[PDB]
Design a protein around this ligand. Structure first.
Ligand SMILES: Nc1ncnc2c1ncn2[C@@H]1O[C@H](COP(=O)(O)OP(=O)(O)O)[C@@H](O)[C@H]1O
Ligand SMILES: Nc1ncnc2c1ncn2[C@@H]1O[C@H](COP(=O)(O)OP(=O)(O)O)[C@@H](O)[C@H]1O
Ligand SMILES: [Mg+2]
Lengths: 52, 77, 106, 77, 52, 63, 526, 52, 151
């Protein structure tokens, strides 16, 4: 049920990551997902390589 | 190899094997209509399967245990 | 470990003498604390041999069958008479077969 | 070479760390003999007979021809 | 996925659906911020600078 | 770079194996217009490489 | 006795010639190889190709366009060169059909080699193909439908045509959004055919669905230093003047004095001339000033002190697009302020797109010029999206020029081939066989379309043939699930011009290549 | 029904596999430099320039 | 991934490997070349060939026999080798029909190439050809006439 839980390098295990003040803007993750998915979709449409 | 869809056919055969206890259901490669290999008379020796599994496991163990290669790299003629 | 002292001009003879002293002390300690049992019964002697063989074998690709091979090795060695020639233990390798198919013939 | 497909060499892990430490130790051992009142100077022939006699570490490391980046770091230091 | 016999177009469409669902999930996770909250900005910058 | 015929010293004509000559000026340093090469002879506001026109930025006489 | 196979040698070193069988073999092999390469990129389920340049830059290019694929390949087979030139000319004439025409020519030449193997003189094949082309063309013309009178039906036709054009390309992911985008961009031209009036800006980053058509115009230039960065109710003045140490055009003139005081006076006179020119420009009563050439520091400072934006170095395309979108006049003299029209827009400002700043024109007066912003994940994605939009805009402009439309999805090919078969059934001799081969290639086109989708092409093509012979003139492939259906309801439509051009160009190239019986090559330079 | 389309051409599958292998190799190469415990890389160009 | 199209090089120098479409292309090309070469020497109006050897003696041989044409040539295509061995075995079994069997095999493989281009699995082609061979053999046997009783 807890969603603010992540890798805690300082403690060495799993803890509420907000206690370590490890936060990042949502735009970074959203852009990462969108761009990676678009690149994968573009690559999946390729089926031949031609040397110019 | 028989042109059928792999994942769908394998999933259906596995589900049929789980539903009714029948370890004789396989892949209808020749399209005879039925999936029961006991009726289709597709028979292999037990020793063959046991040897296949054993040899594959041992060779995979060897390949996994190797973590270093020292080739001469001379590319000799 | 002795490299840093070598770099700072320590005489090699001192290092050699220290190594000899430490090695003598360690060997004496090993001989002192090594566990031996003075009962001379065959059952626990065979158990000791099997345990030593398993430990020696638990680093190789046959480690999964180390008990089987260890028992076979113990039997093979115990069938040797008094000098334990290696040439009296034939080893034939036949391609094809599982490790568990290996056999020892009396 | 391999799936990475980069036109060049690649060292990873303990190998590159050891190489960097070796380069730094080489630079240190070059000038280790010129430290303290019981230190001694050095001659630096400049490939055409020019001679530079010095004890200053900066001059020695600047006049030397170094190629390893981890050693250029110490020279610039 | 391809080794099982799945056409790349199906894979791309499924990945698009997964990306849309993931964007929704990430948006549901996040919380709003105010530029007057200096502590949040400092924490974001520090999280950016831990790996460097 | 093959051709760097400095010009009217207000402008510089430069070209290389790219195949598209570039018109630069000295003061501003901005590429005025890249004309879509080994020679950059000027008028013996126009130049020949194909004759190009400054006033229109297009080839006017081909031979 | 052959020219090359003779006791005496009649050629230079390196020259070569191939007689009838060898020349036909070479031509057919080259053409079939080109057709096989360009195909499998055809139809809604066609895939893309990667073009690795071997040059210094090693440019990377992934594309689905047949013309682009055929352009950037090293071709030595002369017949393949003929087909490549065909594809290029087809691209120049109309936006789409580059792959279809090449595939049709390749299939025609394959049927031609079959007929030659069946001991048929190539002239008979050519005559039969000419008759078949005439019949197919007249049938396709009879099948055309026009909706230019009804504005709503014409807009629906534009929607369908843009969707069909974008179906094969990478934009099929957001086909609906991109179809609306392209249709609006074309309709904003107010009937003009100027495809250069539509500017496509490719900015890296962001999703492909973030691409949009700006309601006004976007300029990628910069404003001066002291000039304002935002103007409401702008009064545009578009110019093509010097604004940069504009020397008097008497090139034989020079300053020759006997004192530096006179030199300073002449310098002040030059500066006063520039100031008077700027005052004459400002007499028009303007807020913004776009010049095609550069603006130096003194006129820039004067404009800034006047509170006027001075956008500089807007090239010929830039000033033309600004004139089209704002209604201004590209002036070069300012002695008659009342005779020059000024462009107008509600607002000018700077916008932040990605990491680059651009000038935004909002609330434009005329708007007969569009700026389409493309956002993508890679440079290759942006380039392919630009190519797909170019194809869609070209086809939409052609449809605007000529509103006649024909049904796609193999329907046109089935109808033309059915007409050809009907003609062949009434023709005696081997011309009937040639006509049947022509129809066979026409069927092979949607057969390849269905092959690219993984469907059962034989059954689908048989069903299409039966439906078209029965009288169902609008039957076609339904790629959504893999059946046949009515192309009118499904809204699969394409320009009549494009299909007719594809058919005619393919027939012409097949006839030209088939006429060849000898290939003679001169010694190359290398 | 029986068998479906034969798919006589195997080149598209090989192209897809090669593209995936290259992408996976790049991801594995840069994997080590992720997170607060990630480590930098030193790259020496053909010109001899060095960057960390 | 295939052996040749793998980042690691798994073969000795000079050894290669041809996958499905390439192997079919090479086999069909070799078979069609053999069939086209051996034909035109078929039927009453067939013409003969000249076999000029490249050896030191440079043996000259004019011939109309398909088996002699096929055996006395430098064959590198493995499918062409299969057809050549077929012709030799046919000659060994009976003295005639070498050209006929070679041409029939070449035509069958040409039709197989067309069928493969039409997206048909080769096992289906093989099963259909087995049925066709059964039918044709039965028809030919039923068509045979014997006159050994009357001298
Ligand atoms: N949604 C669709 N359904 C059926 N067929 C289509 C569809 N979209 C395009 N096609 C067909 O695909 C063919 C090829 O179009 P495309 O590959 O986009 O450009 P080109 O005509 O240059 O090959 C056209 O002849 C068209 O009939
Ligand atoms: N007089 C003939 N009329 C019609 N067909 C013939 C005649 N003589 C031979 N043939 C046909 O020519 C075919 C080829 O025979 P031939 O050219 O001798 O080579 P091979 O017998 O090795 O195939 C045979 O199948 C035969 O049916
Ligand atoms: Mg198209």
């Amino acid at each position: 049920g807890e969603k603010t839980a992540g890798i805690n390098v300082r403690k060495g295990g799993i803890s509420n990551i907000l206690e370590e003040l490890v936060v990042q803007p949502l735009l970074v993750s959203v852009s990462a997902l969108t761009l990676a998915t678009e690149t994968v979709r573009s690559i999946l449409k390729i089926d031949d390589v031609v040397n110019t | 190899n028989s042109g059928m869809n792999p994942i769908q056919t394998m999933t259906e055969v596995r589900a049929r094997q789980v539903k009714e206890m029948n370890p004789a259901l396989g892949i209808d490669c020749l399209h005879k209509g039925t999936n029961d290999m006991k009726q289709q008379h597709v028979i292999e020796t037990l020793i063959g399967k046991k040897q296949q599994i054993s040899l594959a496991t041992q060779m995979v163990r060897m390949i996994l245990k190797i973590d270093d290669i020292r080739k001469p790299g001379e590319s000799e003629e | 470990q002795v490299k840093p002292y070598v770099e700072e001009g320590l005489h090699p003879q001192i290092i050699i003498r220290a190594f000899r002293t430490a090695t003598q002390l360690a060997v004496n300690k090993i001989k002192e604390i090594a566990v031996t049992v003075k009962k001379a019964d065959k059952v626990e002697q065979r158990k000791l041999l099997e345990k030593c063989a398993m430990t020696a074998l638990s680093s190789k690709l046959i480690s999964q069958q180390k008990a089987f091979f260890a028992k076979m090795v113990v039997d093979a060695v115990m069938m040797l008479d008094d000098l334990l020639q290696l040439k009296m233990i034939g080893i034939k390798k036949v391609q094809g077969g599982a490790l568990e198919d290996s056999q020892l013939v009396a | 070479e391999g799936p990475l497909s980069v036109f060049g060499d690649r060292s990873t892990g303990e190998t590159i760390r050891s190489q960097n430490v070796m380069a730094a130790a080489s630079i240190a051992n070059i000038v280790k003999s010129s430290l303290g009142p019981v230190g001694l100077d050095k001659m630096l022939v400049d490939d055409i007979g020019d001679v530079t006699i010095t004890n200053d570490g900066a001059t020695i490391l600047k006049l030397l021809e170094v190629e390893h980046p981890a050693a250029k770091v110490l020279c610039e230091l | 996925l391809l080794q099982k016999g799945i056409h790349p177009t199906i894979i791309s469409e499924s990945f698009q659906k997964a990306l849309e669902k993931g964007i929704e999930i990430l948006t549901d996770m996040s919380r709003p911020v105010e530029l007057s909250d200096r502590e949040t900005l400092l924490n974001s910058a520090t999280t950016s600078l831990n790996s460097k | 770079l093959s051709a760097c015929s400095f010009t009217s010293d207000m402008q510089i004509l430069t070209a290389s194996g790219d195949g598209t000559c570039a018109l630069w000026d000295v003061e501003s340093g901005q590429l005025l217009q890249s004309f879509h090469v080994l020679c950059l002879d000027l008028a013996p506001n126009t130049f020949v490489s194909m004759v190009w026109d400054m006033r229109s930025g297009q080839c006017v006489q081909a031979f | 006795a052959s020219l090359s196979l003779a006791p005496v040698n009649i050629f230079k070193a390196g020259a070569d010639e191939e007689r009838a069988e060898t020349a036909r073999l070479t031509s057919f092999i080259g053409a079939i190889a080109i057709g096989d390469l360009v195909k499998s990129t055809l139809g809604p389920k066609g895939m893309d190709k990667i073009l690795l340049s071997s040059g210094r830059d090693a440019s990377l290019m992934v594309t689905n366009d047949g013309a682009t694929i055929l352009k950037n390949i090293g071709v030595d087979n002369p017949a393949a060169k003929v087909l490549v030139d065909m594809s290029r000319v087809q691209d120049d004439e109309v936006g789409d059909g580059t792959t279809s025409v090449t595939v049709l020519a390749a299939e025609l030449l394959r049927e031609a080699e079959s007929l030659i193997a069946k001991k048929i003189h190539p002239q008979t094949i050519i005559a039969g193909w000419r008759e078949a082309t005439k019949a197919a063309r007249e049938a396709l013309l009879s099948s055309a439908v026009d909706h230019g009178s009804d504005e709503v039906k014409f807009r629906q036709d534009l929607m369908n045509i843009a969707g069909t054009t974008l179906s094969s390309k990478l934009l099929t992911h957001h086909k609906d959004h991109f179809t609306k985008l392209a249709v609006e961009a074309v309709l904003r031209l107010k009937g003009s055919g100027n495809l250069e009036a539509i500017h496509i800006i490719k900015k890296l980053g962001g999703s492909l669905a973030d691409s949009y058509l700006d309601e006004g115009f976007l300029l990628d230039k910069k404003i001066g230093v002291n000039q304002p960065k935002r103007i409401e109710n702008a009064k545009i003045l578009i110019a093509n003047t010097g604004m940069d140490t504009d020397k008097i055009k008497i090139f034989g003139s020079r300053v020759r004095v006997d004192s530096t005081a006179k030199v300073a006076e002449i310098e002040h006179a030059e500066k006063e001339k520039m100031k008077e020119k700027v005052e004459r420009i400002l007499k028009h009563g303007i807020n913004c000033f776009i010049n095609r050439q550069l603006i130096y520091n003194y006129p820039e400072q004067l404009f800034g002190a006047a509170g006027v934006m001075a956008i500089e170095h807007a090239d010929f395309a830039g000033v033309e697009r600004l004139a089209l979108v704002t209604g201004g006049e590209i002036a070069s003299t300012f002695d008659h302020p009342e005779l020059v029209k000024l462009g107008s827009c509600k607002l000018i400002e700077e916008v932040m797109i990605g990491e680059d700043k651009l000038i935004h024109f909002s609330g434009v007066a005329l708007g007969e010029a569009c700026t389409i912003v493309l956002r993508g994940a890679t440079q290759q994605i942006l380039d392919e999206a630009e190519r797909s939009l170019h194809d869609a805009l070209c086809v939409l402009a052609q449809t605007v020029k000529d509103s006649r439309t024909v049904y796609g999805g193999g329907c046109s090919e089935m109808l033309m081939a059915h007409a050809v078969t009907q003609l062949a059934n009434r023709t005696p001799g081997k011309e009937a066989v040639a006509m049947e081969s022509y129809a066979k290639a026409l069927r092979m086109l949607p057969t390849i379309i269905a092959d690219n989708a993984g469907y059962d092409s034989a059954d689908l093509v048989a069903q299409l043939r039966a439906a078209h012979s029965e009288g169902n003139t609008t039957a076609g492939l339904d790629m959504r699930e893999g059946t046949i259906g009515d192309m009118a309801i499904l809204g699969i439509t394409e320009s009549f011009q494009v299909k007719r051009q594809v058919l005619l160009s393919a027939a012409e190239a097949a006839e030209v290549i088939l006429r060849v019986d000898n290939i003679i090559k001169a010694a190359p330079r290398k | 029904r029986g068998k479906g389309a034969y798919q006589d051409r195997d080149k598209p599958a090989q192209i897809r596999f090669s593209n995936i292998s290259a992408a996976k190799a790049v991801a594995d190469a840069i994997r080590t430099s992720l997170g607060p415990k990630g480590m930098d890389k030193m790259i020496q160009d053909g010109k001899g320039d060095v960057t960390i």
